[PDB]
Design a protein around this ligand. Structure first.
Ligand code: NAP
Ligand code: NAP
Ligand code: NAP
Lengths: 122, 326, 326, 326
């Protein structure tokens, strides 16, 4: 249960190492990935980033999956953080669903050359 | 390449090779030979000498101390280290409690005839003493000027990280080194677990028994030679390993490595030692030597170090087939 | 079961039985007998000896010290503890102020002819000194190497928690032990209040007067024997308790326990002592003995400990009918 | 104006002029002359004397110490400072590791025959030792009473700020001074980088070589005089600079400044020295002198200080044409 201290622009966060280890592919869950942010003088990881977002990132580990955007945090900012902490695409997708968005389709005339050519005027 | 290295990330500079005193000093060899060995080492740039309260029940410290006093070498050109844990038969004379760390070091310093050691090590972990008590005591003897730095020995990385963590919490001094066993047939800890600690909290490794007590030298290809360590009274455990099933297996692999040695143009011991020094996480390697011939030959491991290329190392891994999992 | 226990959760290992010096050393018994007692104890594995500046006005410390010096026992195999509070008639010679703690310990160490004690205790709470001043002074004498650890005596759990709390706030050293009175007719504090502290902050208990000064031995079934403590000049208070109404009541219950003793195959004192050791929160029990016969018999309490089953203990509670409320 | 200044923002008051011992003591001049120089300085209110373990391989410290001991001056009326870094040929005898800082200062104090120095300086930055190890060691020797304060020398403002920062983080003692080179042809660091540090964290500057080893004195207008420093065996580097292309250029500008000197009614050295003292960030200026004539003349720089008006300074900048960019 070795504890881990995460300092976000001065805002102090603490959790257990097994809590982060729950998601091995994320930034905070990968020893080789967070190594770069460790301050050996203060025994903490320091990130010069957005404060309001982190409660949510951390809770994602603690809750075991729940990734909710804080009511007071813009969606453009929070998604940038989700990407930075490398929570992965599977989580971002589910996050974006619950946030509202969701969709995507199309696909021009498969080869055709001329089929996919006309199918662009009608 | 560099003969002198920093011990971990501290400012203390040690020769990549040091000379220890287990078995030999006050034991297997004579005081005159011990003196001959240290002089040879010192005159060759080696500035690191390791001992322990437990070695020959404090006898090795006395011999080491008599030499330093007799030769008149400047204390500032030496790096003396001693380990603490087993200091007597009484219940209170063993462990990492504050009482034993202070009493133990005071008694070692007395036998060594020194005002202080450069690094005092906890010889092993102590399940019975809170980490805080141990870190505070190490810090106390350092602030008392009885030691310059402190380190661990045979501790897991979990334990070493704990000592570091407790040090930061209470504003104490963190350990700078871990004395771990390291040789061709013992690689897990040094190669898998300590590297993260070296990059994360500056802890360096000072490895011991690079020839596995002689096994990796090749002197046991046939049987147990006369006057060898495996033959000495009290080292039956060692003799068993060599004649063991696993023992024969190691001796067979040693014959395969014997070819890698000639390809590199060196002796087997020089290769075995230079091998331990290939990784940067290893600050220094503590050598053992029952006589001047061995020491002179072993110091030659330094010219082999530059030859340890990726290819040779991968080939040596093939022969050993014991490369640790990442 | 285990003869040696950790004092609370510290790394200091003490024998589950210790020998104290109140009344006897420099007082009731002769210096030769005191020497005989300590030798017997030491030769039986007991490594804990307790004294106090107030005992026989510093006389007990001198006798204890002369023995340690005369027998030449290694200091590292001993655990000497001394209590500080009443050190003189002057206004500034009593209490837990920084001045008296440093002056008191320095004077005790002088009488003891020792460089340091293993544990220095505040003999009792001091309503007139801020907890910070006391915790800082205990910490100062420990960093000065005059003591290895410190503890409290007769403090409430509120007070002990306060000392611990102040220690963490200022980065000082927390106490590790509380010397509390504990015996079949005094159980509240040790059984109800200290267990939480032992699990919460590692404070262990070192209990005193396990035979209630002799009362629980059974030597007072009839009246006040010649040469007993209750008879000695200066212990009238003790004689009164024994002849008290409550006194007779206790003596009656002792006759009932006398049966539990024979069922377990031991003497009453051995049962009374082994009883105090049944709970894990009790690190050690300090014994009193006016002669070698008593000590030899009392040390036998250790073979009784394994027999103290749930049933026997519940039966002993029935007889006593003073089991403390949870 | 004020003869005595605070060193940075500390409570230590130093004379705006101090006398150093590089080259001269135990070297260029005789012990009797050194004594004559210090007496003159001391009798003139100068209370600051600077030395270093490296000066004449510890010889200057001995001479300085013999004088202080011979003259019987009260230690409390003196401000002795010494620098640590190069202390021997061994690998472990140089640098800012804890081992060398403690060993180095202990050896200097020994040669100086003093219990402590007022300020110990790290002679230069040490890329091989963690700032924490250095700050802790400086703090340790100060708490041991071997030094009263500590400072840096030849450190960048980044490094000085780092030492201060680490000091606050671990509750250690921050440096109070930086010994930087400062003279008419070396102005960047003192005038551009240190002022922010003086106002921000109280670090003051104690500048050295105000006459650029003699260059700025004007004694080299023609060629290399006999018995001058540029002529001495071992100072070929200095001779080269003076005869250099840049050397001739400086000598030409010195002839232009020679006019500013007469306008102010003083000698060139007095102007060069008084110039260094014009800015408040400069606490004191360490003087060099191979004989009593030079010292007497140089101390006169103090009467010139009041005359250094905006105009004169802007004119001196015109002649030098090396005013550093803000
Ligand atoms: N827990 C710890 O911290 C710990 C534990 C053990 C050791 N250490 C340190 O490490 C040192 C010991 O290393 P080690 O002695 O155990 O393994 P080595 O691998 O250091 O052992 C050397 C011993 O093996 C034999 N040997 C060495 N070089 C040889 C050569 N070129 N040719 C033939 N034989 C050779 C020697 O003669 P013989 O075979 O005739 O005896 C010698 O006594 C000690 O000084 C100690 O300070 C630390
Ligand atoms: N505030 C404190 O911290 C504090 C206070 C008091 C004591 N203590 C410690 O605890 C120790 C004292 O415990 P204690 O002496 O008060 O109670 P005990 O229960 O320790 O008292 C023993 C005394 O009772 C009698 N006795 C003991 N064993 C006997 C036996 N087997 N048969 C017959 N009689 C026996 C003895 O002879 P006699 O009856 O002839 O005298 C002896 O002097 C001291 O050494 C002291 O260090 C600490
Ligand atoms: N890294 C450091 O921390 C560091 C480095 C260097 C120096 N320092 C300190 O600063 C001091 C040295 O300053 P410095 O000696 O290098 O430059 P100065 O500018 O202090 O040099 C004075 C030297 O130049 C010549 N000189 C001085 N006054 C003169 C005058 N009025 N007329 C003619 N010639 C004169 C002298 O005679 P000569 O020309 O005949 O020799 C003298 O030896 C040392 O004591 C040292 O403690 C510190």
């Amino acid at each position: 249960s070795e504890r881990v201290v995460i300092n976000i622009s001065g805002l102090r966060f603490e959790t257990q190492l097994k809590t982060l280890a729950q998601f091995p592919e994320t930034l905070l869950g990968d020893p080789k990935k967070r190594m770069r942010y460790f301050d050996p003088l203060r025994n903490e990881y320091f990130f010069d980033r957005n404060r309001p977002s982190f409660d949510a990132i951390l809770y994602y580990y603690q809750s075991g999956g729940r990734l909710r955007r804080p009511v007071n945090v813009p969606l453009d900012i929070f998604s940038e953080e989700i990407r930075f902490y490398e929570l992965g695409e599977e989580a971002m997708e589910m996050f974006r669903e619950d946030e509202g968005y969701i969709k995507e389709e199309e696909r021009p005339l498969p080869e055709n050359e001329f089929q996919r050519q006309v199918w662009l005027l009608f | 390449l560099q003969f002198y290295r920093n011990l971990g990330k501290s400012g203390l500079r040690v020769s990549c090779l040091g000379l220890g005193t287990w078995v030999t000093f006050g034991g297997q060899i004579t005081d005159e030979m011990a003196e001959h060995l240290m002089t040879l080492a010192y005159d060759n740039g080696i500035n690191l000498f390791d001992t322990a309260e437990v070695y020959a029940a404090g006898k090795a410290e006395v011999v080491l101390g008599n030499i330093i006093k007799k030769k008149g070498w400047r204390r500032s050109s030496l790096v003396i280290t001693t380990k603490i844990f087993w200091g007597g038969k009484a219940e209170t004379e063993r462990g990492l409690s504050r009482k034993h760390i202070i009493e133990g070091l005071k008694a070692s310093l007395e036998r060594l005839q020194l005002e202080y050691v450069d690094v005092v090590f906890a010889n092993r972990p102590d399940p019975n003493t809170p980490m805080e008590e141990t870190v505070r005591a190490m810090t106390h003897v350092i602030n008392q000027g009885m030691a310059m730095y402190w380190g661990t020995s045979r501790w897991s990385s979990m334990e070493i990280m704990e000592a570091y963590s407790v040090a930061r919490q209470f504003n104490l001094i963190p350990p700078i080194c871990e004395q771990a066993e390291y040789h061709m047939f013992q690689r897990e800890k040094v190669e898998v677990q300590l590297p993260e600690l070296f990059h994360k909290i500056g802890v360096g490794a000072m490895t011991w028994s690079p020839l596995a007590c002689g096994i990796v030298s090749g002197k046991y290809d046939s049987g147990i030679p006369p006057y060898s360590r495996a033959s000495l009274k009290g080292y039956q455990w060692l003799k068993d390993k060599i004649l063991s099933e696993e023992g024969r297996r190691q001796q067979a692999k040693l014959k395969e490595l014997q070819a890698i040695a000639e390809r590199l143009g060196c002796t087997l011991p020089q290769l075995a030692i230079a091998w331990c020094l290939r990784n940067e996480g290893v600050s220094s390697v503590l050598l053992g030597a029952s006589n001047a011939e061995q020491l002179m030959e072993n110091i030659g491991a330094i010219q082999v170090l530059p030859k340890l290329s990726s290819s040779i190392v991968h080939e040596i891994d093939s022969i050993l087939g014991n490369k640790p999992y990442s």
